[PDB]
Swiss-Prot record:
The lineage of its organism: Bacteria, Pseudomonadati, Pseudomonadota, Gammaproteobacteria, Vibrionales. Involved in DNA damage recognition. Binds DNA containing O(6)-methylguanine. Binds to the damaged base and flips the base out of the DNA duplex into an extrahelical conformation, which allows processing by repair proteins. GO terms for molecular function: catalytic activity; DNA binding. Keywords: DNA damage, DNA-binding. Changing residue 23 to F: Slightly impairs ability to bind alkylated DNA. GO terms for biological process: DNA repair. It comes from the Bacteria. This is DNA base-flipping protein. Gene3D superfamilies: Winged helix-like DNA-binding domain superfamily/Winged helix DNA-binding domain. The record marks 23 as: Required for phosphate rotation/nucleotide flipping.
Amino acid sequence: MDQFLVQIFAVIHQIPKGKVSTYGEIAKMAGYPGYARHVGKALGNLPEGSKLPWFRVINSQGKISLKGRDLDRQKQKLEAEGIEVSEIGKIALRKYKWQPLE
């Protein structure tokens, strides 16, 4: 398994149920600056129901990076987490941001 993927995934496992973080924050904690979009590839490359919670990481714009079926794919998973996701794939970061202070 790719070291990069192991690092970013390891970080993502610290995200609790009903929290979302940005690819930049995950990449930073993994030690790979600029690999934000790359973290996005990894999660989109995973199956819809993997052991790793992939749906808990979105873009800095507070929106789902996946589109079409994959948009509602992440959405339905987040609805099982209790997150208010707007129809076009929009999430309120300022309330749903992953804060490991709880």
